[PDB]
Amino acid sequence: SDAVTIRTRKVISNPLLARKQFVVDVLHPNRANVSKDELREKLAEVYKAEKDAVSVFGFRTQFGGGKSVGFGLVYNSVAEAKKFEPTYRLVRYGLAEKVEK
Amino acid sequence: LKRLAAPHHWLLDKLSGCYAPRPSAGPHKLRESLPLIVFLRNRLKYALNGREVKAILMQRHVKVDGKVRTDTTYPAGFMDVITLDATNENFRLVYDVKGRFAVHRITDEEASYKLGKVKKVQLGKKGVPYVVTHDGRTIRYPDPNIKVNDTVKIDLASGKITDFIKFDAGKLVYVTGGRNLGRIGTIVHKERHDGGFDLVHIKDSLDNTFVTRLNNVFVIGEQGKPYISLPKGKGIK
Amino acid sequence: GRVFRYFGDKLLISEAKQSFTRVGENNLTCISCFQPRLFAYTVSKDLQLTKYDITDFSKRPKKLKYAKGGAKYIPNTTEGHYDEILTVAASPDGKYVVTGGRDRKLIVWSTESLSPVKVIPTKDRRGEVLSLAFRKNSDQLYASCADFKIRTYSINQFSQLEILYGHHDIVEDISALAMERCVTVGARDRTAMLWKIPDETRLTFRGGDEPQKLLRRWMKEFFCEGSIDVVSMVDDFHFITGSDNGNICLWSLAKKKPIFTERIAHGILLLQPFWITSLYAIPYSNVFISGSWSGSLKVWKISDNLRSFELLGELSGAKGVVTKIQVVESKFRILASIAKEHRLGRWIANVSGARNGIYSAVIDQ
RNA sequence: CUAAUACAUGCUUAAAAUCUCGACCCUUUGGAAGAGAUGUAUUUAUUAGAUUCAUAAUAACUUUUCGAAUCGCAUGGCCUUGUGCUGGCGAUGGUUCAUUCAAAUUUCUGCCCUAUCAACUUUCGAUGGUAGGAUAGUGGCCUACCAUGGUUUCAACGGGUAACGGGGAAUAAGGGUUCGAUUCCGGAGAGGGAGCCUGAGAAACGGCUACCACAUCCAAGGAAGGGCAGGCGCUUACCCAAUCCUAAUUCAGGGAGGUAGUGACAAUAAAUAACGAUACAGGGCCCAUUC
RNA sequence: GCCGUUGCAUUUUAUGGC
C-alpha cells in the first residue's frame, strides 16, 4: 500500500502458446516482499482478462530492499491456464488438486 | 546422448543438465541434423521447457517438409522445410559461416520444394529404375540423364521430380561438411583421384580458393542466380 | 529519433513580433508552457505561481488564475511554499503542474482549479529542488537536487521510482526527451553526464579546456570555463551546454571531447564575459536560442552534418536577466522570463532597464 | 466342467477379371472374328544381356511359402432390391528394397629408451596356391594336396620403463605435477569348472542345466544358498519439480538424476560501549636503580 | 498589481524609476 507501481518490460507476442511473456518489475519503497497473490491481481488490470489467466514466479529481490524482479505470464483464456501451465503452479495458484502419492 | 558429447552446431552450453537430446533414427544422420526439440526452444526460443515442446507437438502447429513428425527428437536435416501454420511461418534449415544451423524465414512457395542430391542409382524390381536422395527419400521413374552427384528439386506435394541439375563446372555449389562448411563459388575444376576421395576446387565471388571432398559438394543452381533464397552473409565468409 | 525539422532558413527573424509584459512579481525564476490552446506558468521569488493563457498569438499573455503562499506553511508537510520557488514544470496531460524551491519540498498543483493536490517532502536538509524536467509524453519526473541527486517520480500515482547519485556539486540543469534518458550538469565540477535510467549507467563528458592552450591559439592567430550553467538536449544523439564565459559547447554521444565549442557569444563587459543564463532548443530541429542579461536573445542554426552551427540572429526586445526560455508553435511564439536578478539568488551588476516580465516574439514560417 | 487374444477349414467374385495386338472398316470423342499374356518365397542348371549383376524365360526343387474372413471416426455409397459390389475419413499386418541406429572385418597416422638385442619365423601353416569345411560375410580362420618359402641396417625381431591405455581437465614454457581407478570407451572377474539359451544387438552370471569344493534345515523322507558385502581398528534421510531415457508411451518410472546431516591443522568479518555536565582535591609526571 | 510618462482620451499600445 505504498503506490506499488508494477512495471513490465520485455513483452513478446507468443501466439503459438497463446500467451504474452514479459518481465515483471516490482518497485517497493517502504514495503518488503509483497506477495504472489496481489501481483497476479494488479497486473491483470492492464491486460484485463482475469486473475487466473495470470501466472507468475521467480522473484529474487534486490539486496537491501526496494526492488523485486520475477517472471510473469498472461494467457488468452481460463482453459489455457489448465493446459499450458505446470501442474504444481496450478496447485500453488489454487486451480487444481495435488494428487499426493 | 550426453553433454559435451553433443555437436558444436547445436549451440548448447556446458551447464543445464547432464544428457543431451539424442537425435532419433530417421532419414537424416545424427551428426549433421538438428532435433526438433533443439529447434523451437533453443533457436527460436518460444518454448522454455522440454515439457513445453510436447504440448506444441500434440497441437499440430509444426510439420517438417509437409509432414508433422510429432516425435520429440526427430532428426530434421538439411534443406528441410519446418512449417509453423500458426502465426504463418516457414523455415529452411541452412548452415552458418561457422557451421551452425541458421534461421531463415522463407516464403510460401519456396517452402513448397527442396533440393535433394541423389546418392545412388540402381535398377529396381520389375524393370523400373529409381533414385535415392540424401534425405532418405526414394523416387522411382527418373529422367535417365539424372545420375550421381545431381541435385533434384522435389515437388513436396507428391514424390515426383520437378527439376534436376547436373554436376558441372560453373554451377552454384554449397559445402555440406568439412572445415570449409558454408562456402560458394560454383567450381574451379575437378580431380579424379582413382581410389576415391575426389577433390572439387571452388573459388568464391570474393576470388579465393579452397579444397573439399566430393562428399561435401552440393550444387544448388547456376552461377549467380540461386534456386533458393540464401541468408545474409551469402556463404562468402 | 533524430533531427529532421530543417527550418532555420524559413525563420523570418528581422521582422519578428516583439512585445513585453510587466507583471506583479519580483524575480521570476522560471516559465513552463504547455502544448497539447496553450497555457503558461510562472513562479517568482515572491512565492507566487501565476497561470496565463497564450492561445492567442497576437495578444500579450492575459491573466487566468494566480496563487501565492505565505509564512503560514512553516512546518515539512504543509500544502504551500514558504520560500523562493526555483523551478516549475507542467505535466504533458495538462492536468497537473508542480513547483518547488528553497522550501525543499515538491508541491504538485492542479491545472484546473489551481489547488495543492500533492505535497512531497524531499526528506533532506540539502534536498533542494533546482530543475524539474518531464519525459516527453510521459509522467516520469526528473528532479535535480542540491544534495547532488536526481530523483525520479511518477505523477499519476505519486510515488518514488529511484535516485541517481554521482555528481560533485549542485545539479543545476537537466534536460530530457521522449526516451528514458537525461542530461545533467553539476555546474562547478565542469563536467556533464548522460543518464540511462533502465541501464542505470552514465556517460561522462568533460569540459574545462584551459585558455592557456588558447593562448597558443593566440600565437597562431581567452576566458575560463568555471561553471557549466545550462544543458539542453537537441536529439537523442547530440546535446549542448552553456558556460560562464560565452562558450557554448556542442556535444556528440560518440565524442568524449567537445565536438564543437563556440567562443564568446554574448560578449564581454580585467574584463568579464557574460554568463550563458538561458539555453533552449526547439525539439528535433536545428535551431536553438541562447539568452543573457545583455539584452538580446541570440539564436543559432545547427548545420546538417551536426558539426558546427551558424548565427540566425539577435532579438533585442528583452532587456534584463533572462532566466528561462519557452517556445511554442502552431508560426512560432517565443516567451522569455526576464527577472531583475539571476535564478540562483546571485548578484547582478548595473543592468540597464531593470524590469520584470515576459518577452514575446512571433516568427512566421 | 467351459470361453477366447487357442487348434484345424475356404472365395479373392456377378462368371473370373484386366491388359495388349489383330485379317479387316472408318476419320471416329471409334469396332471386330481370332491371337498372346499376367502375383509370389528356397536350391541348382541354361540362355539373352547386341543397345553370370538388375530384368527375364527355361528345367526341376521345399512340410511347396504367401495370396485382407482386419480396425476405428460414421451404424458409407448406389438401384423397381440381386445369395449385390464393397467400404466416404485413415489404421494395422504381409510381400520386397534402400535409409537410419548400429554391429563386424579393413586403410593410413600416432608416444620413452635399447645393437651391451643381428637376424626372426618353419617344425603338426610359417609363405603362397588348389580344393573343401566353417561363419551373418569375402579370408589358413580350420583341414587334405603341391611348392620352400615371408620380414630386416636411416633398423624386422628380442628386451626394460612398478603409468592397467589414450582423447581429454587444472598450473598454464610446449620440458613437467595430478588423474588414465579418468567426464568418452577398451581388456579382466562375479565360489571354480564344462555344456546350453533369449534378443537385431549378452558370450548375459546383476540368464539356465550338470560337475567339483562347500555349508543350512530336518517331522530322519528329503529340501536349500553361494561364503558375500558394510563398519571399526589409520548415527544417513527426502523427492522425480528440472536434464535425459523408458513406457501397455499427453498418466508414470529410473539403486539415472537432484535436495539436508559432517568444523581450531587451518581461516573469515567485529560486539563487549559513545558523548555531555558539577562539586570536592593535588607532593602530579619524567631522567640518572644512584649523589 | 508600486510610481512616472506617452498615443488611443482610461480599458488597449510603448517606455523610464523603486
PDB file of C-alpha atoms (C1' of nucleotides) in Angstrom, chain D residues 29-245:
ATOM      1  C1'   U D  29     -14.657 -38.316 -78.841  1.00  0.00           C
ATOM      2  C1'   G D  30     -14.256 -45.045 -82.954  1.00  0.00           C
ATOM      3  C1'   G D  31     -15.129 -51.631 -83.575  1.00  0.00           C
ATOM      4  C1'   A D  32     -14.112 -56.794 -84.635  1.00  0.00           C
ATOM      5  C1'   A D  33     -13.769 -62.933 -85.853  1.00  0.00           C
ATOM      6  C1'   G D  34      -9.307 -64.648 -83.541  1.00  0.00           C
ATOM      7  C1'   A D  35      -4.109 -64.287 -81.044  1.00  0.00           C
ATOM      8  C1'   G D  36      -0.790 -63.720 -76.900  1.00  0.00           C
ATOM      9  C1'   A D  37      -0.025 -62.837 -71.590  1.00  0.00           C
ATOM     10  C1'   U D  38      -0.172 -61.717 -66.237  1.00  0.00           C
ATOM     11  C1'   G D  39       1.142 -62.286 -58.129  1.00  0.00           C
ATOM     12  C1'   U D  40       4.938 -64.866 -55.047  1.00  0.00           C
ATOM     13  C1'   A D  41       9.314 -67.089 -51.278  1.00  0.00           C
ATOM     14  C1'   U D  42      14.167 -71.579 -51.455  1.00  0.00           C
ATOM     15  C1'   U D  43      18.231 -74.600 -54.180  1.00  0.00           C
ATOM     16  C1'   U D  44      20.531 -75.871 -58.925  1.00  0.00           C
ATOM     17  C1'   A D  45      21.023 -75.614 -64.411  1.00  0.00           C
ATOM     18  C1'   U D  46      20.730 -72.946 -69.419  1.00  0.00           C
ATOM     19  C1'   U D  47      20.417 -68.556 -72.275  1.00  0.00           C
ATOM     20  C1'   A D  48      19.535 -63.391 -73.679  1.00  0.00           C
ATOM     21  C1'   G D  49      22.272 -59.086 -71.786  1.00  0.00           C
ATOM     22  C1'   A D  50      23.502 -56.537 -79.029  1.00  0.00           C
ATOM     23  C1'   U D  51      21.853 -51.039 -77.388  1.00  0.00           C
ATOM     24  C1'   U D  52      26.553 -64.567 -64.650  1.00  0.00           C
ATOM     25  C1'   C D  53      24.902 -58.014 -61.860  1.00  0.00           C
ATOM     26  C1'   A D  54      19.398 -55.838 -62.322  1.00  0.00           C
ATOM     27  C1'   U D  55      15.430 -57.777 -65.600  1.00  0.00           C
ATOM     28  C1'   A D  56      13.528 -62.267 -67.831  1.00  0.00           C
ATOM     29  C1'   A D  57      12.195 -67.241 -69.555  1.00  0.00           C
ATOM     30  C1'   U D  58      13.729 -72.050 -69.168  1.00  0.00           C
ATOM     31  C1'   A D  59      14.022 -77.405 -66.202  1.00  0.00           C
ATOM     32  C1'   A D  60      13.456 -79.468 -61.636  1.00  0.00           C
ATOM     33  C1'   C D  61      13.146 -78.397 -56.339  1.00  0.00           C
ATOM     34  C1'   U D  62      10.822 -77.179 -50.462  1.00  0.00           C
ATOM     35  C1'   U D  63       6.335 -79.832 -44.759  1.00  0.00           C
ATOM     36  C1'   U D  64       5.680 -76.139 -51.772  1.00  0.00           C
ATOM     37  C1'   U D  65       5.612 -70.231 -48.611  1.00  0.00           C
ATOM     38  C1'   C D  66       2.201 -66.202 -49.015  1.00  0.00           C
ATOM     39  C1'   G D  67      -2.356 -64.639 -51.516  1.00  0.00           C
ATOM     40  C1'   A D  68      -7.017 -58.614 -46.207  1.00  0.00           C
ATOM     41  C1'   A D  69     -12.822 -63.839 -43.111  1.00  0.00           C
ATOM     42  C1'   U D  70      -8.911 -56.682 -40.227  1.00  0.00           C
ATOM     43  C1'   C D  71      -9.568 -51.943 -37.076  1.00  0.00           C
ATOM     44  C1'   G D  72     -11.648 -47.241 -35.666  1.00  0.00           C
ATOM     45  C1'   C D  73     -14.451 -41.902 -36.991  1.00  0.00           C
ATOM     46  C1'   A D  74     -19.719 -42.773 -39.043  1.00  0.00           C
ATOM     47  C1'   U D  75     -24.335 -47.527 -37.640  1.00  0.00           C
ATOM     48  C1'   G D  76     -20.873 -45.146 -46.037  1.00  0.00           C
ATOM     49  C1'   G D  77     -22.066 -45.171 -51.174  1.00  0.00           C
ATOM     50  C1'   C D  78     -25.873 -46.990 -55.110  1.00  0.00           C
ATOM     51  C1'   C D  79     -30.973 -49.150 -57.983  1.00  0.00           C
ATOM     52  C1'   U D  80     -38.123 -51.317 -59.165  1.00  0.00           C
ATOM     53  C1'   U D  81     -33.924 -54.547 -54.308  1.00  0.00           C
ATOM     54  C1'   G D  82     -29.501 -59.105 -56.773  1.00  0.00           C
ATOM     55  C1'   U D  83     -27.076 -65.445 -52.113  1.00  0.00           C
ATOM     56  C1'   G D  84     -25.150 -57.342 -54.988  1.00  0.00           C
ATOM     57  C1'   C D  85     -20.169 -54.686 -55.268  1.00  0.00           C
ATOM     58  C1'   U D  86     -17.699 -53.277 -51.479  1.00  0.00           C
ATOM     59  C1'   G D  87     -16.219 -49.631 -47.810  1.00  0.00           C
ATOM     60  C1'   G D  88     -16.643 -41.830 -47.700  1.00  0.00           C
ATOM     61  C1'   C D  89     -12.023 -40.222 -43.400  1.00  0.00           C
ATOM     62  C1'   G D  90      -7.211 -43.187 -42.129  1.00  0.00           C
ATOM     63  C1'   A D  91      -5.363 -47.705 -39.378  1.00  0.00           C
ATOM     64  C1'   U D  92      -2.874 -52.227 -38.836  1.00  0.00           C
ATOM     65  C1'   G D  93      -0.241 -56.573 -40.599  1.00  0.00           C
ATOM     66  C1'   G D  94       2.170 -59.251 -45.145  1.00  0.00           C
ATOM     67  C1'   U D  95       5.422 -59.236 -49.943  1.00  0.00           C
ATOM     68  C1'   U D  96      10.374 -56.620 -51.267  1.00  0.00           C
ATOM     69  C1'   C D  97      14.104 -52.676 -51.458  1.00  0.00           C
ATOM     70  C1'   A D  98      17.003 -48.608 -49.624  1.00  0.00           C
ATOM     71  C1'   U D  99      17.828 -45.409 -45.482  1.00  0.00           C
ATOM     72  C1'   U D 100      18.648 -44.574 -40.023  1.00  0.00           C
ATOM     73  C1'   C D 101      20.517 -46.627 -35.446  1.00  0.00           C
ATOM     74  C1'   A D 102      24.210 -49.545 -35.001  1.00  0.00           C
ATOM     75  C1'   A D 103      27.490 -54.166 -35.095  1.00  0.00           C
ATOM     76  C1'   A D 104      31.550 -56.785 -37.522  1.00  0.00           C
ATOM     77  C1'   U D 105      36.122 -57.083 -40.907  1.00  0.00           C
ATOM     78  C1'   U D 106      39.642 -53.093 -43.189  1.00  0.00           C
ATOM     79  C1'   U D 107      43.415 -48.350 -44.944  1.00  0.00           C
ATOM     80  C1'   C D 108      46.717 -44.744 -43.092  1.00  0.00           C
ATOM     81  C1'   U D 109      48.658 -41.832 -38.993  1.00  0.00           C
ATOM     82  C1'   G D 110      50.403 -41.694 -33.733  1.00  0.00           C
ATOM     83  C1'   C D 111      54.203 -41.986 -27.826  1.00  0.00           C
ATOM     84  C1'   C D 112      60.422 -43.315 -23.978  1.00  0.00           C
ATOM     85  C1'   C D 113      64.924 -45.956 -24.326  1.00  0.00           C
ATOM     86  C1'   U D 114      67.676 -50.010 -26.369  1.00  0.00           C
ATOM     87  C1'   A D 115      72.672 -53.424 -31.485  1.00  0.00           C
ATOM     88  C1'   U D 116      75.946 -54.287 -24.155  1.00  0.00           C
ATOM     89  C1'   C D 117      69.209 -57.382 -28.938  1.00  0.00           C
ATOM     90  C1'   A D 118      71.558 -59.041 -35.913  1.00  0.00           C
ATOM     91  C1'   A D 119      68.945 -61.773 -37.725  1.00  0.00           C
ATOM     92  C1'   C D 120      63.315 -63.549 -36.995  1.00  0.00           C
ATOM     93  C1'   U D 121      59.760 -67.405 -38.357  1.00  0.00           C
ATOM     94  C1'   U D 122      59.386 -73.003 -40.330  1.00  0.00           C
ATOM     95  C1'   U D 123      58.717 -77.870 -37.335  1.00  0.00           C
ATOM     96  C1'   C D 124      51.752 -80.580 -36.984  1.00  0.00           C
ATOM     97  C1'   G D 125      50.760 -73.395 -41.543  1.00  0.00           C
ATOM     98  C1'   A D 126      55.439 -70.136 -41.031  1.00  0.00           C
ATOM     99  C1'   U D 127      54.796 -68.171 -47.004  1.00  0.00           C
ATOM    100  C1'   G D 128      51.927 -68.946 -51.441  1.00  0.00           C
ATOM    101  C1'   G D 129      48.301 -71.513 -54.458  1.00  0.00           C
ATOM    102  C1'   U D 130      44.401 -75.510 -55.161  1.00  0.00           C
ATOM    103  C1'   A D 131      40.020 -77.639 -53.160  1.00  0.00           C
ATOM    104  C1'   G D 132      36.732 -78.349 -49.082  1.00  0.00           C
ATOM    105  C1'   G D 133      34.541 -77.265 -44.219  1.00  0.00           C
ATOM    106  C1'   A D 134      33.098 -73.241 -41.064  1.00  0.00           C
ATOM    107  C1'   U D 135      30.500 -68.131 -40.207  1.00  0.00           C
ATOM    108  C1'   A D 136      25.999 -63.128 -40.759  1.00  0.00           C
ATOM    109  C1'   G D 137      30.474 -62.418 -44.662  1.00  0.00           C
ATOM    110  C1'   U D 138      34.633 -62.442 -48.673  1.00  0.00           C
ATOM    111  C1'   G D 139      39.747 -64.780 -45.788  1.00  0.00           C
ATOM    112  C1'   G D 140      44.944 -70.728 -43.488  1.00  0.00           C
ATOM    113  C1'   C D 141      40.085 -68.805 -39.837  1.00  0.00           C
ATOM    114  C1'   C D 142      40.403 -74.575 -39.922  1.00  0.00           C
ATOM    115  C1'   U D 143      41.619 -79.190 -42.676  1.00  0.00           C
ATOM    116  C1'   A D 144      43.971 -82.729 -47.061  1.00  0.00           C
ATOM    117  C1'   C D 145      47.370 -81.856 -51.561  1.00  0.00           C
ATOM    118  C1'   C D 146      51.724 -79.128 -54.013  1.00  0.00           C
ATOM    119  C1'   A D 147      55.968 -75.582 -53.563  1.00  0.00           C
ATOM    120  C1'   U D 148      60.077 -73.969 -49.824  1.00  0.00           C
ATOM    121  C1'   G D 149      59.132 -70.115 -48.594  1.00  0.00           C
ATOM    122  C1'   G D 150      57.692 -64.480 -45.997  1.00  0.00           C
ATOM    123  C1'   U D 151      60.168 -59.760 -42.792  1.00  0.00           C
ATOM    124  C1'   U D 152      65.097 -56.649 -41.947  1.00  0.00           C
ATOM    125  C1'   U D 153      70.825 -51.658 -41.413  1.00  0.00           C
ATOM    126  C1'   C D 154      68.080 -44.007 -41.917  1.00  0.00           C
ATOM    127  C1'   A D 155      66.916 -50.883 -38.348  1.00  0.00           C
ATOM    128  C1'   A D 156      62.486 -56.795 -38.543  1.00  0.00           C
ATOM    129  C1'   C D 157      62.606 -59.189 -34.070  1.00  0.00           C
ATOM    130  C1'   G D 158      64.187 -59.850 -28.741  1.00  0.00           C
ATOM    131  C1'   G D 159      64.189 -56.568 -24.105  1.00  0.00           C
ATOM    132  C1'   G D 160      63.303 -52.556 -19.528  1.00  0.00           C
ATOM    133  C1'   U D 161      60.089 -48.098 -18.143  1.00  0.00           C
ATOM    134  C1'   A D 162      56.339 -50.663 -10.601  1.00  0.00           C
ATOM    135  C1'   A D 163      51.939 -45.360 -15.764  1.00  0.00           C
ATOM    136  C1'   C D 164      46.348 -51.399 -16.242  1.00  0.00           C
ATOM    137  C1'   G D 165      45.553 -47.445 -22.056  1.00  0.00           C
ATOM    138  C1'   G D 166      44.522 -42.956 -24.656  1.00  0.00           C
ATOM    139  C1'   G D 167      41.270 -38.468 -26.165  1.00  0.00           C
ATOM    140  C1'   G D 168      40.957 -35.245 -22.589  1.00  0.00           C
ATOM    141  C1'   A D 169      40.588 -31.341 -17.222  1.00  0.00           C
ATOM    142  C1'   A D 170      43.541 -27.583 -13.929  1.00  0.00           C
ATOM    143  C1'   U D 171      49.117 -24.554 -13.005  1.00  0.00           C
ATOM    144  C1'   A D 172      49.485 -22.689 -17.673  1.00  0.00           C
ATOM    145  C1'   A D 173      57.310 -22.553 -21.133  1.00  0.00           C
ATOM    146  C1'   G D 174      55.024 -26.658 -25.159  1.00  0.00           C
ATOM    147  C1'   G D 175      60.014 -29.843 -20.677  1.00  0.00           C
ATOM    148  C1'   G D 176      56.875 -31.017 -16.283  1.00  0.00           C
ATOM    149  C1'   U D 177      52.630 -32.231 -11.500  1.00  0.00           C
ATOM    150  C1'   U D 178      47.731 -34.885 -10.933  1.00  0.00           C
ATOM    151  C1'   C D 179      44.063 -38.403 -12.851  1.00  0.00           C
ATOM    152  C1'   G D 180      44.363 -42.909 -17.146  1.00  0.00           C
ATOM    153  C1'   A D 181      40.787 -46.392 -10.572  1.00  0.00           C
ATOM    154  C1'   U D 182      39.658 -40.872 -15.547  1.00  0.00           C
ATOM    155  C1'   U D 183      33.971 -36.997 -17.615  1.00  0.00           C
ATOM    156  C1'   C D 184      34.119 -40.985 -23.540  1.00  0.00           C
ATOM    157  C1'   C D 185      35.487 -46.225 -24.255  1.00  0.00           C
ATOM    158  C1'   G D 186      38.590 -50.976 -24.352  1.00  0.00           C
ATOM    159  C1'   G D 187      40.773 -55.898 -21.513  1.00  0.00           C
ATOM    160  C1'   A D 188      39.904 -58.828 -16.594  1.00  0.00           C
ATOM    161  C1'   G D 189      36.209 -61.447 -12.691  1.00  0.00           C
ATOM    162  C1'   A D 190      31.484 -62.408 -10.285  1.00  0.00           C
ATOM    163  C1'   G D 191      32.838 -69.660  -5.385  1.00  0.00           C
ATOM    164  C1'   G D 192      35.898 -72.645  -9.593  1.00  0.00           C
ATOM    165  C1'   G D 193      34.573 -75.837 -13.763  1.00  0.00           C
ATOM    166  C1'   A D 194      32.135 -77.953 -18.989  1.00  0.00           C
ATOM    167  C1'   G D 195      27.547 -77.753 -21.853  1.00  0.00           C
ATOM    168  C1'   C D 196      23.222 -74.874 -23.378  1.00  0.00           C
ATOM    169  C1'   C D 197      19.651 -70.408 -24.276  1.00  0.00           C
ATOM    170  C1'   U D 198      16.904 -65.364 -25.379  1.00  0.00           C
ATOM    171  C1'   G D 199      17.248 -60.796 -28.141  1.00  0.00           C
ATOM    172  C1'   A D 200      18.611 -57.085 -34.294  1.00  0.00           C
ATOM    173  C1'   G D 201      22.268 -56.048 -30.520  1.00  0.00           C
ATOM    174  C1'   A D 202      24.698 -60.621 -23.989  1.00  0.00           C
ATOM    175  C1'   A D 203      29.023 -64.874 -24.643  1.00  0.00           C
ATOM    176  C1'   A D 204      24.353 -62.386 -20.389  1.00  0.00           C
ATOM    177  C1'   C D 205      26.293 -64.595 -14.103  1.00  0.00           C
ATOM    178  C1'   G D 206      23.072 -58.022 -11.988  1.00  0.00           C
ATOM    179  C1'   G D 207      20.225 -65.981 -17.923  1.00  0.00           C
ATOM    180  C1'   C D 208      19.633 -71.940 -17.318  1.00  0.00           C
ATOM    181  C1'   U D 209      21.351 -77.416 -16.666  1.00  0.00           C
ATOM    182  C1'   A D 210      25.199 -80.533 -14.838  1.00  0.00           C
ATOM    183  C1'   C D 211      30.312 -81.358 -12.206  1.00  0.00           C
ATOM    184  C1'   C D 212      33.550 -80.005  -8.035  1.00  0.00           C
ATOM    185  C1'   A D 213      34.942 -77.664  -3.127  1.00  0.00           C
ATOM    186  C1'   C D 214      31.037 -76.346   0.158  1.00  0.00           C
ATOM    187  C1'   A D 215      27.529 -75.465   4.380  1.00  0.00           C
ATOM    188  C1'   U D 216      21.883 -74.517   6.334  1.00  0.00           C
ATOM    189  C1'   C D 217      17.256 -77.245   7.877  1.00  0.00           C
ATOM    190  C1'   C D 218      15.195 -81.993   9.258  1.00  0.00           C
ATOM    191  C1'   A D 219       8.916 -84.064  11.378  1.00  0.00           C
ATOM    192  C1'   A D 220      15.498 -88.530   9.865  1.00  0.00           C
ATOM    193  C1'   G D 221      11.712 -88.940   3.920  1.00  0.00           C
ATOM    194  C1'   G D 222      14.249 -85.131   1.855  1.00  0.00           C
ATOM    195  C1'   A D 223      14.513 -79.849   0.870  1.00  0.00           C
ATOM    196  C1'   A D 224      18.111 -75.358   0.014  1.00  0.00           C
ATOM    197  C1'   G D 225      22.135 -70.575  -0.743  1.00  0.00           C
ATOM    198  C1'   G D 226      26.824 -69.023  -2.713  1.00  0.00           C
ATOM    199  C1'   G D 227      30.594 -67.777   1.648  1.00  0.00           C
ATOM    200  C1'   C D 228      29.277 -62.151   0.408  1.00  0.00           C
ATOM    201  C1'   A D 229      29.083 -57.062   1.399  1.00  0.00           C
ATOM    202  C1'   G D 230      29.422 -52.985   5.193  1.00  0.00           C
ATOM    203  C1'   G D 231      31.959 -50.885   9.510  1.00  0.00           C
ATOM    204  C1'   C D 232      35.757 -50.245  13.312  1.00  0.00           C
ATOM    205  C1'   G D 233      40.870 -50.724  14.286  1.00  0.00           C
ATOM    206  C1'   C D 234      44.552 -45.419  10.210  1.00  0.00           C
ATOM    207  C1'   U D 235      24.463 -42.251  13.531  1.00  0.00           C
ATOM    208  C1'   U D 236      22.489 -41.428   6.899  1.00  0.00           C
ATOM    209  C1'   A D 237      17.205 -39.094   5.101  1.00  0.00           C
ATOM    210  C1'   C D 238      13.818 -36.983   1.421  1.00  0.00           C
ATOM    211  C1'   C D 239      11.818 -36.089  -3.912  1.00  0.00           C
ATOM    212  C1'   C D 240      11.029 -37.363  -9.854  1.00  0.00           C
ATOM    213  C1'   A D 241       9.733 -30.061  -9.807  1.00  0.00           C
ATOM    214  C1'   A D 242      14.024 -29.541 -13.875  1.00  0.00           C
ATOM    215  C1'   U D 243      18.118 -32.696 -17.836  1.00  0.00           C
ATOM    216  C1'   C D 244      17.797 -37.087 -20.476  1.00  0.00           C
ATOM    217  C1'   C D 245      15.990 -42.291 -21.035  1.00  0.00           C
TER     218        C D 245
END
